[PDB]
Design a protein around this ligand. Structure first.
Ligand SMILES: CC(=O)SCCNC(=O)CCNC(=O)[C@H](O)C(C)(C)COP(=O)(O)OP(=O)(O)OC[C@H]1O[C@@H](n2cnc3c(N)ncnc32)[C@H](O)[C@@H]1OP(=O)(O)O
Lengths: 198, 198
Protein backbone atom coordinates (compact mmCIF):
# COMPACT_ATOMS: atom_id res chain seq x y z
CA UNK A 1 0.00 0.00 0.00
CA UNK A 2 1.35 3.40 -1.05
CA UNK A 3 1.60 6.11 -3.69
CA UNK A 4 1.90 3.59 -6.53
CA UNK A 5 -0.82 1.35 -5.06
CA UNK A 6 -4.02 3.31 -4.24
CA UNK A 7 -6.75 0.90 -5.37
CA UNK A 8 -7.10 -2.81 -6.12
CA UNK A 9 -5.85 -4.14 -9.48
CA UNK A 10 -8.56 -5.22 -11.96
CA UNK A 11 -7.23 -8.84 -11.99
CA UNK A 12 -7.62 -9.10 -8.18
CA UNK A 13 -10.07 -11.90 -7.43
CA UNK A 14 -10.82 -10.36 -4.01
CA UNK A 15 -12.67 -7.25 -5.23
CA UNK A 16 -15.80 -9.30 -5.75
CA UNK A 17 -15.45 -10.97 -2.36
CA UNK A 18 -15.01 -7.63 -0.58
CA UNK A 19 -17.16 -5.24 -2.54
CA UNK A 20 -20.22 -7.24 -3.58
CA UNK A 21 -21.13 -8.01 0.02
CA UNK A 22 -20.77 -4.36 1.22
CA UNK A 23 -23.07 -3.35 -1.60
CA UNK A 24 -25.47 -6.07 -0.43
CA UNK A 25 -25.22 -4.73 3.13
CA UNK A 26 -25.85 -1.15 1.96
CA UNK A 27 -28.84 -2.22 -0.11
CA UNK A 28 -30.49 -3.94 2.84
CA UNK A 29 -29.52 -1.21 5.30
CA UNK A 30 -31.11 1.32 2.93
CA UNK A 31 -34.16 -0.96 2.78
CA UNK A 32 -34.02 -1.25 -1.03
CA UNK A 33 -33.13 -4.88 -0.75
CA UNK A 34 -36.07 -7.30 -0.88
CA UNK A 35 -34.04 -10.38 0.06
CA UNK A 36 -31.89 -10.45 3.18
CA UNK A 37 -28.52 -12.17 3.20
CA UNK A 38 -27.90 -13.82 6.56
CA UNK A 39 -24.87 -16.14 6.27
CA UNK A 40 -22.08 -13.95 4.87
CA UNK A 41 -19.46 -16.76 4.71
CA UNK A 42 -21.94 -18.82 2.73
CA UNK A 43 -22.42 -15.75 0.56
CA UNK A 44 -18.72 -15.47 -0.20
CA UNK A 45 -18.72 -19.18 -1.04
CA UNK A 46 -21.48 -18.40 -3.53
CA UNK A 47 -19.32 -15.55 -4.94
CA UNK A 48 -16.15 -17.70 -5.27
CA UNK A 49 -18.15 -20.31 -7.19
CA UNK A 50 -18.69 -17.54 -9.69
CA UNK A 51 -14.93 -17.09 -9.96
CA UNK A 52 -13.48 -20.47 -10.90
CA UNK A 53 -10.15 -21.28 -12.58
CA UNK A 54 -11.58 -21.22 -16.13
CA UNK A 55 -12.35 -17.55 -15.53
CA UNK A 56 -9.53 -16.45 -13.29
CA UNK A 57 -6.50 -18.77 -13.14
CA UNK A 58 -4.43 -17.08 -15.84
CA UNK A 59 -5.69 -13.68 -14.73
CA UNK A 60 -4.37 -14.44 -11.23
CA UNK A 61 -1.07 -15.79 -12.56
CA UNK A 62 -0.45 -12.59 -14.49
CA UNK A 63 -1.31 -10.60 -11.40
CA UNK A 64 1.17 -12.64 -9.42
CA UNK A 65 3.90 -11.98 -12.00
CA UNK A 66 3.12 -8.33 -11.48
CA UNK A 67 3.30 -8.60 -7.66
CA UNK A 68 6.63 -10.33 -7.97
CA UNK A 69 8.18 -7.72 -10.26
CA UNK A 70 6.71 -4.87 -8.27
CA UNK A 71 8.04 -6.36 -5.02
CA UNK A 72 11.47 -6.61 -6.62
CA UNK A 73 11.92 -2.97 -7.54
CA UNK A 74 10.17 -3.62 -10.82
CA UNK A 75 12.62 -5.69 -12.85
CA UNK A 76 10.98 -8.19 -15.18
CA UNK A 77 12.45 -11.70 -15.60
CA UNK A 78 14.90 -11.95 -18.46
CA UNK A 79 13.56 -14.78 -20.75
CA UNK A 80 15.50 -16.10 -23.73
CA UNK A 81 13.89 -17.28 -26.90
CA UNK A 82 16.33 -19.25 -29.03
CA UNK A 83 13.91 -19.14 -31.99
CA UNK A 84 14.26 -15.43 -32.69
CA UNK A 85 12.63 -15.54 -36.10
CA UNK A 86 9.60 -17.64 -35.14
CA UNK A 87 6.44 -15.86 -36.30
CA UNK A 88 4.36 -17.27 -33.41
CA UNK A 89 7.02 -16.23 -30.92
CA UNK A 90 7.43 -12.67 -32.12
CA UNK A 91 3.65 -12.17 -32.25
CA UNK A 92 3.28 -13.51 -28.70
CA UNK A 93 6.13 -11.26 -27.54
CA UNK A 94 4.18 -8.24 -28.74
CA UNK A 95 1.45 -9.01 -26.22
CA UNK A 96 4.01 -10.03 -23.64
CA UNK A 97 6.27 -6.96 -23.68
CA UNK A 98 3.32 -4.65 -23.76
CA UNK A 99 1.96 -6.14 -20.54
CA UNK A 100 5.26 -6.31 -18.63
CA UNK A 101 5.46 -10.12 -18.27
CA UNK A 102 9.15 -10.40 -19.09
CA UNK A 103 12.11 -8.84 -20.78
CA UNK A 104 12.69 -11.02 -23.84
CA UNK A 105 16.08 -11.76 -25.32
CA UNK A 106 15.96 -13.15 -28.88
CA UNK A 107 18.61 -15.37 -30.52
CA UNK A 108 19.61 -15.26 -34.14
CA UNK A 109 21.23 -13.05 -36.71
CA UNK A 110 20.23 -9.50 -35.72
CA UNK A 111 19.68 -8.23 -39.30
CA UNK A 112 17.40 -11.22 -40.08
CA UNK A 113 15.25 -10.91 -36.93
CA UNK A 114 14.92 -7.10 -37.22
CA UNK A 115 13.80 -7.94 -40.75
CA UNK A 116 11.17 -10.48 -39.76
CA UNK A 117 9.92 -8.13 -37.07
CA UNK A 118 9.50 -5.34 -39.64
CA UNK A 119 7.89 -7.64 -42.20
CA UNK A 120 5.33 -8.65 -39.53
CA UNK A 121 4.95 -5.01 -38.53
CA UNK A 122 5.39 -5.45 -34.78
CA UNK A 123 6.85 -2.16 -33.62
CA UNK A 124 6.73 -3.00 -29.89
CA UNK A 125 9.92 -4.99 -30.29
CA UNK A 126 12.41 -2.41 -31.54
CA UNK A 127 14.11 -2.29 -28.14
CA UNK A 128 14.47 -6.00 -27.59
CA UNK A 129 17.92 -7.45 -27.15
CA UNK A 130 18.97 -9.67 -30.02
CA UNK A 131 21.97 -11.92 -29.54
CA UNK A 132 23.97 -13.97 -32.02
CA UNK A 133 25.60 -16.75 -29.97
CA UNK A 134 29.06 -17.01 -31.61
CA UNK A 135 29.62 -13.29 -31.34
CA UNK A 136 28.39 -12.95 -27.84
CA UNK A 137 31.14 -11.81 -25.53
CA UNK A 138 30.46 -14.60 -23.01
CA UNK A 139 30.43 -17.28 -25.73
CA UNK A 140 33.82 -18.82 -25.00
CA UNK A 141 33.31 -18.95 -21.24
CA UNK A 142 30.04 -20.69 -22.04
CA UNK A 143 31.78 -23.29 -24.22
CA UNK A 144 34.35 -23.84 -21.46
CA UNK A 145 31.49 -24.57 -19.06
CA UNK A 146 29.72 -27.00 -21.44
CA UNK A 147 33.05 -28.68 -22.09
CA UNK A 148 33.74 -29.15 -18.43
CA UNK A 149 30.26 -30.47 -17.92
CA UNK A 150 30.33 -33.02 -20.70
CA UNK A 151 33.96 -33.83 -21.47
CA UNK A 152 33.43 -37.40 -20.40
CA UNK A 153 30.09 -37.53 -22.20
CA UNK A 154 31.32 -37.22 -25.77
CA UNK A 155 31.78 -33.45 -25.92
CA UNK A 156 35.28 -31.93 -26.13
CA UNK A 157 36.23 -28.31 -26.84
CA UNK A 158 35.79 -28.48 -30.59
CA UNK A 159 32.37 -30.02 -30.23
CA UNK A 160 31.46 -27.77 -27.31
CA UNK A 161 32.20 -24.78 -29.49
CA UNK A 162 30.05 -26.30 -32.25
CA UNK A 163 27.09 -26.86 -29.91
CA UNK A 164 27.37 -23.52 -28.20
CA UNK A 165 26.87 -21.89 -31.57
CA UNK A 166 23.35 -23.42 -31.57
CA UNK A 167 20.74 -21.07 -30.02
CA UNK A 168 19.15 -23.88 -28.09
CA UNK A 169 22.44 -24.59 -26.39
CA UNK A 170 23.28 -20.93 -25.99
CA UNK A 171 19.94 -20.24 -24.35
CA UNK A 172 20.24 -23.20 -22.02
CA UNK A 173 23.72 -21.97 -21.04
CA UNK A 174 22.56 -18.36 -20.49
CA UNK A 175 19.94 -19.66 -18.13
CA UNK A 176 22.38 -21.97 -16.42
CA UNK A 177 25.05 -19.30 -16.02
CA UNK A 178 22.52 -16.71 -14.80
CA UNK A 179 22.68 -14.49 -17.85
CA UNK A 180 19.00 -15.19 -18.09
CA UNK A 181 16.26 -15.94 -15.64
CA UNK A 182 14.51 -18.44 -17.85
CA UNK A 183 14.03 -19.61 -21.43
CA UNK A 184 11.27 -20.75 -23.85
CA UNK A 185 11.76 -22.97 -26.90
CA UNK A 186 10.24 -25.57 -29.18
CA UNK A 187 7.85 -23.43 -31.15
CA UNK A 188 9.48 -24.51 -34.38
CA UNK A 189 11.11 -27.93 -33.77
CA UNK A 190 10.12 -31.30 -32.26
CA UNK A 191 10.17 -31.59 -28.48
CA UNK A 192 13.11 -33.92 -28.13
CA UNK A 193 15.44 -31.71 -30.10
CA UNK A 194 14.31 -28.61 -28.22
CA UNK A 195 14.43 -30.22 -24.73
CA UNK A 196 17.65 -32.13 -25.12
CA UNK A 197 20.04 -29.22 -24.80
CA UNK A 198 18.09 -28.12 -21.71
CA UNK B 1 51.77 -43.30 -77.99
CA UNK B 2 52.38 -40.18 -80.02
CA UNK B 3 54.08 -36.81 -80.28
CA UNK B 4 53.23 -36.04 -76.66
CA UNK B 5 54.15 -39.50 -75.43
CA UNK B 6 57.53 -40.71 -76.76
CA UNK B 7 58.80 -42.35 -73.59
CA UNK B 8 57.44 -43.69 -70.32
CA UNK B 9 56.62 -41.17 -67.60
CA UNK B 10 59.43 -41.03 -65.06
CA UNK B 11 57.20 -42.59 -62.43
CA UNK B 12 55.92 -45.41 -64.61
CA UNK B 13 56.16 -48.49 -62.37
CA UNK B 14 56.41 -50.84 -65.33
CA UNK B 15 59.85 -49.47 -66.32
CA UNK B 16 61.88 -51.73 -64.01
CA UNK B 17 59.92 -54.80 -65.15
CA UNK B 18 60.64 -53.96 -68.75
CA UNK B 19 64.14 -52.57 -68.72
CA UNK B 20 66.02 -54.48 -66.03
CA UNK B 21 65.55 -57.90 -67.62
CA UNK B 22 66.74 -56.63 -71.03
CA UNK B 23 69.84 -55.16 -69.37
CA UNK B 24 70.41 -58.50 -67.65
CA UNK B 25 69.95 -60.26 -70.98
CA UNK B 26 72.45 -57.94 -72.65
CA UNK B 27 74.92 -58.45 -69.83
CA UNK B 28 74.70 -62.18 -70.36
CA UNK B 29 74.94 -62.06 -74.16
CA UNK B 30 77.93 -59.74 -73.91
CA UNK B 31 79.71 -62.11 -71.50
CA UNK B 32 80.24 -59.63 -68.65
CA UNK B 33 77.65 -61.34 -66.48
CA UNK B 34 79.05 -63.83 -63.98
CA UNK B 35 75.71 -65.23 -62.84
CA UNK B 36 73.21 -66.29 -65.43
CA UNK B 37 69.50 -65.64 -64.97
CA UNK B 38 67.54 -68.71 -65.97
CA UNK B 39 63.88 -68.35 -64.96
CA UNK B 40 62.72 -65.03 -66.43
CA UNK B 41 59.18 -65.22 -65.04
CA UNK B 42 60.66 -65.70 -61.60
CA UNK B 43 62.89 -62.71 -62.25
CA UNK B 44 60.04 -60.44 -63.37
CA UNK B 45 58.14 -61.49 -60.28
CA UNK B 46 61.11 -60.65 -58.14
CA UNK B 47 61.20 -57.21 -59.78
CA UNK B 48 57.44 -56.67 -59.15
CA UNK B 49 58.15 -57.32 -55.46
CA UNK B 50 60.53 -54.30 -55.30
CA UNK B 51 57.94 -51.57 -55.96
CA UNK B 52 55.05 -52.45 -53.63
CA UNK B 53 52.19 -50.30 -52.32
CA UNK B 54 54.34 -48.80 -49.52
CA UNK B 55 56.47 -47.30 -52.27
CA UNK B 56 53.92 -46.44 -54.99
CA UNK B 57 50.23 -46.67 -53.99
CA UNK B 58 49.54 -43.02 -53.12
CA UNK B 59 51.94 -41.81 -55.83
CA UNK B 60 49.86 -43.76 -58.34
CA UNK B 61 46.58 -42.50 -56.92
CA UNK B 62 47.76 -38.92 -57.23
CA UNK B 63 48.95 -39.49 -60.80
CA UNK B 64 45.62 -41.10 -61.53
CA UNK B 65 43.78 -38.02 -60.19
CA UNK B 66 45.90 -35.80 -62.38
CA UNK B 67 45.28 -37.71 -65.61
CA UNK B 68 41.59 -37.97 -64.75
CA UNK B 69 41.72 -34.15 -64.52
CA UNK B 70 43.55 -33.85 -67.81
CA UNK B 71 40.94 -35.97 -69.57
CA UNK B 72 38.23 -33.49 -68.53
CA UNK B 73 39.91 -30.28 -69.64
CA UNK B 74 41.82 -29.72 -66.44
CA UNK B 75 38.65 -29.88 -64.37
CA UNK B 76 39.32 -30.50 -60.70
CA UNK B 77 36.80 -32.24 -58.46
CA UNK B 78 34.88 -29.74 -56.37
CA UNK B 79 35.30 -30.95 -52.77
CA UNK B 80 33.46 -29.19 -49.95
CA UNK B 81 34.85 -29.01 -46.41
CA UNK B 82 32.23 -28.07 -43.85
CA UNK B 83 34.91 -27.39 -41.21
CA UNK B 84 36.24 -24.27 -42.87
CA UNK B 85 38.01 -23.18 -39.69
CA UNK B 86 39.87 -26.41 -38.83
CA UNK B 87 43.59 -25.70 -38.74
CA UNK B 88 44.31 -29.32 -39.89
CA UNK B 89 41.92 -28.99 -42.80
CA UNK B 90 43.38 -25.66 -43.96
CA UNK B 91 47.02 -26.79 -43.62
CA UNK B 92 46.31 -29.92 -45.60
CA UNK B 93 44.44 -27.80 -48.16
CA UNK B 94 47.70 -25.87 -48.72
CA UNK B 95 49.36 -29.08 -50.04
CA UNK B 96 46.25 -30.30 -51.85
CA UNK B 97 45.69 -27.08 -53.77
CA UNK B 98 49.38 -26.64 -54.43
CA UNK B 99 49.58 -30.16 -55.90
CA UNK B 100 46.42 -29.72 -58.05
CA UNK B 101 44.40 -32.46 -56.26
CA UNK B 102 41.05 -30.71 -55.87
CA UNK B 103 39.17 -27.48 -55.84
CA UNK B 104 38.13 -26.89 -52.20
CA UNK B 105 34.95 -25.16 -51.07
CA UNK B 106 35.07 -24.04 -47.45
CA UNK B 107 31.99 -23.57 -45.21
CA UNK B 108 31.64 -21.05 -42.38
CA UNK B 109 31.47 -17.31 -41.74
CA UNK B 110 33.89 -15.94 -44.37
CA UNK B 111 35.33 -13.29 -42.01
CA UNK B 112 36.37 -15.81 -39.35
CA UNK B 113 37.88 -18.33 -41.78
CA UNK B 114 39.83 -15.57 -43.59
CA UNK B 115 41.01 -14.55 -40.12
CA UNK B 116 42.14 -18.11 -39.56
CA UNK B 117 43.87 -18.35 -42.95
CA UNK B 118 45.72 -15.13 -42.28
CA UNK B 119 46.53 -16.20 -38.70
CA UNK B 120 48.07 -19.44 -39.98
CA UNK B 121 49.63 -17.73 -43.02
CA UNK B 122 48.52 -20.00 -45.88
CA UNK B 123 48.55 -17.62 -48.78
CA UNK B 124 47.58 -20.20 -51.41
CA UNK B 125 44.04 -20.08 -50.05
CA UNK B 126 43.19 -16.45 -50.65
CA UNK B 127 41.28 -17.70 -53.69
CA UNK B 128 39.27 -20.47 -52.06
CA UNK B 129 35.51 -20.24 -52.21
CA UNK B 130 33.98 -19.70 -48.82
CA UNK B 131 30.27 -20.27 -48.41
CA UNK B 132 27.99 -19.44 -45.54
CA UNK B 133 25.24 -22.05 -45.87
CA UNK B 134 22.13 -20.01 -45.01
CA UNK B 135 23.05 -17.18 -47.42
CA UNK B 136 23.81 -19.35 -50.43
CA UNK B 137 21.46 -18.95 -53.43
CA UNK B 138 20.54 -22.65 -53.48
CA UNK B 139 19.84 -22.75 -49.73
CA UNK B 140 16.04 -22.83 -49.79
CA UNK B 141 16.07 -25.18 -52.79
CA UNK B 142 18.20 -27.46 -50.64
CA UNK B 143 15.84 -27.13 -47.69
CA UNK B 144 12.96 -28.18 -49.92
CA UNK B 145 14.91 -31.24 -51.05
CA UNK B 146 15.71 -32.26 -47.45
CA UNK B 147 12.07 -31.73 -46.51
CA UNK B 148 10.81 -33.96 -49.30
CA UNK B 149 13.48 -36.49 -48.36
CA UNK B 150 12.70 -36.83 -44.64
CA UNK B 151 9.23 -35.30 -43.99
CA UNK B 152 8.08 -38.65 -42.61
CA UNK B 153 11.32 -39.06 -40.67
CA UNK B 154 10.82 -36.17 -38.28
CA UNK B 155 11.79 -33.32 -40.61
CA UNK B 156 9.20 -30.86 -41.82
CA UNK B 157 10.05 -27.48 -43.39
CA UNK B 158 10.94 -25.66 -40.18
CA UNK B 159 13.45 -28.25 -39.05
CA UNK B 160 14.73 -28.76 -42.60
CA UNK B 161 15.50 -25.10 -42.58
CA UNK B 162 17.29 -25.33 -39.22
CA UNK B 163 19.38 -28.38 -40.24
CA UNK B 164 20.33 -27.10 -43.68
CA UNK B 165 22.05 -24.15 -41.95
CA UNK B 166 24.49 -26.67 -40.46
CA UNK B 167 27.64 -26.93 -42.63
CA UNK B 168 27.55 -30.73 -42.43
CA UNK B 169 23.99 -30.88 -43.74
CA UNK B 170 24.79 -28.22 -46.32
CA UNK B 171 27.84 -30.07 -47.64
CA UNK B 172 25.98 -33.37 -47.79
CA UNK B 173 23.24 -31.66 -49.78
CA UNK B 174 25.71 -29.98 -52.12
CA UNK B 175 27.22 -33.31 -53.00
CA UNK B 176 23.75 -34.85 -53.38
CA UNK B 177 22.44 -32.09 -55.65
CA UNK B 178 25.57 -32.01 -57.80
CA UNK B 179 26.81 -28.58 -56.77
CA UNK B 180 29.93 -30.29 -55.45
CA UNK B 181 31.53 -33.58 -56.50
CA UNK B 182 32.45 -34.86 -53.08
CA UNK B 183 32.91 -33.85 -49.45
CA UNK B 184 35.29 -34.42 -46.57
CA UNK B 185 34.32 -33.87 -42.98
CA UNK B 186 34.92 -35.01 -39.49
CA UNK B 187 38.20 -33.32 -38.72
CA UNK B 188 36.92 -31.65 -35.58
CA UNK B 189 33.88 -33.60 -34.30
CA UNK B 190 33.20 -37.27 -33.56
CA UNK B 191 32.40 -39.65 -36.39
CA UNK B 192 28.77 -40.40 -35.54
CA UNK B 193 27.80 -36.81 -35.70
CA UNK B 194 29.81 -36.22 -38.87
CA UNK B 195 28.54 -39.25 -40.75
CA UNK B 196 24.88 -39.04 -39.73
CA UNK B 197 23.92 -36.13 -42.00
CA UNK B 198 25.76 -37.79 -44.89
C1 LIG C 1 37.05 -43.11 -37.66
C2 LIG C 1 36.41 -43.62 -36.36
O1 LIG C 1 37.06 -43.59 -35.36
S1 LIG C 1 34.70 -44.25 -36.24
C3 LIG C 1 34.78 -44.55 -34.50
C4 LIG C 1 33.53 -45.25 -33.95
N1 LIG C 1 32.43 -45.44 -34.96
C5 LIG C 1 31.18 -44.80 -34.60
O2 LIG C 1 31.10 -44.19 -33.61
C6 LIG C 1 29.89 -44.91 -35.49
C7 LIG C 1 29.04 -46.06 -34.73
N2 LIG C 1 27.80 -46.09 -35.45
C8 LIG C 1 26.77 -45.09 -35.07
O3 LIG C 1 26.98 -44.32 -34.15
C9 LIG C 1 25.49 -45.12 -35.84
O4 LIG C 1 25.47 -46.43 -36.40
C10 LIG C 1 25.53 -44.06 -36.99
C11 LIG C 1 26.21 -42.79 -36.52
C12 LIG C 1 26.35 -44.69 -38.18
C13 LIG C 1 24.15 -43.66 -37.50
O5 LIG C 1 23.15 -44.24 -36.74
P1 LIG C 1 22.17 -43.25 -35.74
O6 LIG C 1 23.02 -42.32 -34.91
O7 LIG C 1 21.35 -44.20 -34.91
O8 LIG C 1 21.17 -42.29 -36.66
P2 LIG C 1 20.19 -42.99 -37.68
O9 LIG C 1 20.59 -44.46 -37.72
O10 LIG C 1 18.68 -42.84 -37.28
O11 LIG C 1 20.53 -42.16 -39.18
C14 LIG C 1 21.44 -42.85 -40.05
C15 LIG C 1 20.85 -42.99 -41.47
O12 LIG C 1 21.60 -43.77 -42.21
C16 LIG C 1 20.89 -45.23 -42.35
N3 LIG C 1 21.80 -46.16 -41.83
C17 LIG C 1 22.61 -45.98 -40.77
N4 LIG C 1 23.34 -47.10 -40.55
C18 LIG C 1 22.95 -47.97 -41.51
C19 LIG C 1 23.36 -49.27 -41.76
N5 LIG C 1 24.36 -50.19 -41.09
N6 LIG C 1 22.80 -49.95 -42.80
C20 LIG C 1 21.89 -49.38 -43.59
N7 LIG C 1 21.49 -48.09 -43.34
C21 LIG C 1 22.02 -47.41 -42.29
C22 LIG C 1 19.81 -45.17 -41.56
O13 LIG C 1 18.66 -45.93 -42.06
C23 LIG C 1 19.44 -43.67 -41.49
O14 LIG C 1 18.87 -43.28 -42.65
P3 LIG C 1 17.20 -43.13 -42.76
O15 LIG C 1 16.72 -42.81 -41.40
O16 LIG C 1 16.82 -41.99 -43.65
O17 LIG C 1 16.66 -44.43 -43.34
Amino acid sequence: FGRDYLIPKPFDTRVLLWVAPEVAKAAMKSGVATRAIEDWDQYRESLEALQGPSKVFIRSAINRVHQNSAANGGELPRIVFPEGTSTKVLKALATLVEEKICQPILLGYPERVKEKIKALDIPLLNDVSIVHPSSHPKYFSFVEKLYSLRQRKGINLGEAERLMADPNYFAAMMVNQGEADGMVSGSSINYADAVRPI
